Amino acid sequence: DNMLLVDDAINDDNSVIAINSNTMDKLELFRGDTVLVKGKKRKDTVLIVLIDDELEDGACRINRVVRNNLRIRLGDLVTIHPCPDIKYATRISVLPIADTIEGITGNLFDVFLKPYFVEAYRPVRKGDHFVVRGGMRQVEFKVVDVEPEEYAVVAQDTIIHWEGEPINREDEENNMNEVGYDDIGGCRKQMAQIREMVELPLRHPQLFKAIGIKPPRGVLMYGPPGTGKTLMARAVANETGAFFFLINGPEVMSKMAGESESNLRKAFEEAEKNAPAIIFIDEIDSIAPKRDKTNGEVERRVVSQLLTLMDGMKARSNVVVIAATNRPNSIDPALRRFGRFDREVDIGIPDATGRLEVLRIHTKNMKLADDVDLEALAAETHGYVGADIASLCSEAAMQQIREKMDLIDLDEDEIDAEVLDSLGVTMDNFRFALGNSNPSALRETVVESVNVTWDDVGGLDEIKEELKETVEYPVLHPDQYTKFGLSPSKGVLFYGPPGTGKTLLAKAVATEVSANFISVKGPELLSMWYGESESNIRDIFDKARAAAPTVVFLDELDSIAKDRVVNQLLTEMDGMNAKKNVFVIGATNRPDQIDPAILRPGRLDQLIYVPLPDENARLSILNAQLRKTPLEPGLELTAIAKATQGFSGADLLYIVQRAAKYAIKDSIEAHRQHPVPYITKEHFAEAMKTAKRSVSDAELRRYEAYSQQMKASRGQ
């Protein structure tokens, strides 16, 4: 109906929009009528309607300036509404753009704007852009202020105040706030959570009045630093169009004694007095740290003031508080109960698709060369949070500049435009930047996503069936468990010789139910045991809960199951709600060494033996690990697999790696002498000659004895 299609207007007028006759009839509009046009990001403008039959029905023509102001592109949809109550601008105060006025002599206003508005009656709104073509020059301007507000018609008698200093252009670009969802990718789930928890309470209050509930107020986003928490909050606030009131932590805590509390009070009062509002308390951990941290009075008064303000806003006011912290345990525990930040959101490192989307978003203004395979970079970059990807792009650009520095004279302050034209990033620059990049997200426990299916694991059909019936059914068919009153199994414990691929089974199980996968290796467990780590078991399980359905994975658990840490783990496992879709998968190589308490019912009770791969499994592993390697045509791996009886997956990977090493050595030698694009069978034969099993026969016999003991324990 009113969703007129956007088109490039032939005319350059800043207050004219051409529409088809059919649409004009549909909306009862007419030529010369002033209407309010709304596009995207809630941007609005006032345009004079003109009939033009060339346009197809339902299409409207607008110029470049109006499209830029509305932040919409050609082919978009704009909603047109009547604007009959627009008054004539009593006084319009406008200043030009500095760059556009360089080299202009005489009075700019008389030269350019004086004929533009006289006998024009152009409706102007604050924050708009209008361009005037005078003589041989074209100058853009800004509608700084309009009286009456917020918009009005510039009549002949309207007084135009052009006095003032030039306005720099860089402000609009380098301050690119009002960023929409189009600048964020790879975090659709958390974005949807924040949207459903913020927009609906504000954009459609009547819903909760009809249902009759008090919508939740607090929201607590947390995750690794540099994952774009601030960007997400800013985007949501801008999309909602509410009275965003960013509050920083360091900014508040740097004030004189007796002033930070006043700033907090004034901020909350301002947000309340202009409802709706979205208070965003960035880096709340600096304002309200953990109790065992700083005990000073100045560090206590601020926390008490924040608690009082939080408890004081519980009313009809439409105020939403969003806080961002690195970890859930860093915040004072008093701020995570009812009436406070009771809803949590967890941000996790993106997957390959997320990294590709981030690369596309950042690398849209770069002068990229043709040889760009962004998919390749996304595949090769693992664990890179958004900040790491931005740094990678910057480093690649800098490397390109360095390479092209040969034709650059540092002493000369002038650079030929031709040289700047030749500038262009290449895949080599990106690979160099990847070589020099330093990711840091993985150094701490972090929620991630895995996409491994029942094809990277060879054999183990019975174990796969057991895992399916243990995990897949509870998540996908909870109704059946409710029907039969059977509580879902919490977790399972894998045991077997190292290298059998337990992590692969865990990742496959996580993928099948579409559950985020949390990993906790031995070093992290020991560091927590010694109390010199930045994360705690309570923190790990809080993140698992907030990111449900999750799958926690404990590796080489025997190192700690030899215990205060084990006590905390038991307490957390007892605490977790049964209905919550959180599964703890433990792995160890010496099952009898595990503390018996961990094996009691209601805990990691189910015990699963992971055997060594079979001949067919060996062949499958060899094929899987060699998928992206050039093999000699006609080569069959059946003989090699047969010769590798009793070899775990790690052994086969070692064999493949040695064969590739021989091949690359031969290729390097041949090139240096100046060939062998693939790997010949002789390389594999040499690798097998240099093979060695990783498990002694005695340990295998011990594992088999333990398995037989377990089977007899359940055999009758």
Partner: protein, 474 residues
Amino acid sequence: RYGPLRIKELAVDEELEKEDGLIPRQKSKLCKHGDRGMCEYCSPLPPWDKEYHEKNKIKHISFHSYLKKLNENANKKENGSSYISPLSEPDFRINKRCHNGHEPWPRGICSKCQPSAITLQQQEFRMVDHVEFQKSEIINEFIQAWRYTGMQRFGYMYGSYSKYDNTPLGIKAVVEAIYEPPQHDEQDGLTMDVEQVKNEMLQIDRQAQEMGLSRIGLIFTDLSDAGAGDGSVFCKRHKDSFFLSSLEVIMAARHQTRHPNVSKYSEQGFFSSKFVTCVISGNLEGEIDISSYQVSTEAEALVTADMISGSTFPSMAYINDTTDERYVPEIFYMKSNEYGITVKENAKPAFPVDYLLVTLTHGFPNTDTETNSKFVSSTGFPWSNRQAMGQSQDYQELKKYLFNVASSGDFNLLHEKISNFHLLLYINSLQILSPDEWKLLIESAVKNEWEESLLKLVSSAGWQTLVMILQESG
């Protein structure tokens, strides 16, 4: 409001806010760096630098500079907040509508609507810096009133504000004329009905605004002659004794609250009225030098909710008690002991008022510089409310004063005898003239380039009728 509030105030405030006041400094001998680049001692001095003031013998920081300090201290540009307003006047009245669940104050009060303890501390910013009298006759005639009669006096003073270069971003109040309300003055004091005085002052203020003036303070004389043969007066007001007794401070605070200063950087849009109060008592010698003062912002907001009253001790103000419709929390006045340590002393019985004042600096314009006086007057037609003395405005006084010059000419002499404040007010009260006729009268009397305007005035019929009645009257 998504940014700075929108409101219009005086031109002085606007022009002051335009500037920056940075005080440049040159390469100190302690710098270790090239010509360009500045370390910590070559950087421009902010206008609010406390060391610069106390080193220059300036006691307060020229309020506009205080506003600059507050804006710099916070309000980062383009991000970090949504412009929390920096200035806010104190308010001690208990919120009658808080309702955490409790009822109004008289029968219930939570810990959120309980006026917290008030900590008095000497103010640091003085809104108006230099009070300046265009001509010494303005105060000389005022004192002459007491000279003839012997009783005390009291009068509002009209004028306008302007910049003051001698202090960083400082202001001066230039007083052009003094108007005396009807008061029942006595030997030890004076009395004047507030209602009638304000009723009269309303129309006097309307006329003065028509003339371009404005009410910018009150001046009263505390003078008692000594037994010396020549003119000598005891110095009752100095460091030893009080400067302004409690009653005068109360009255000044009331007046200040009744003439708010409209500003753009507050939630309510007003802050700390520009209304200087001057007193005449005589310096340590026999002179009759004047002074100036201005009650601090707390005392301005401390007396709106009652909470202060005069005391038999001149220099101390008594404190009232709690009751329905008036809640008075504990008051601590914070001084600094000789060892450079701040000390808080509870003062419920009574406390000195010197923590409720800020001092100004009076003066007169240089006697050899440009004279922009609006009125070449203050020696002529009797002033308004001097009924007690022989002074009495009336037709025969006008005949004796401005008949010989009016009947002949001497347009220079006519102008100099026509630009008198009280004469203009009296002839306006005569109502012999029409509205635009009086407008052109004032534009001829209180403006330069006055030839054609005076010619138009004389050519009018109203002036002819006025001179005719003057001639008819003895």
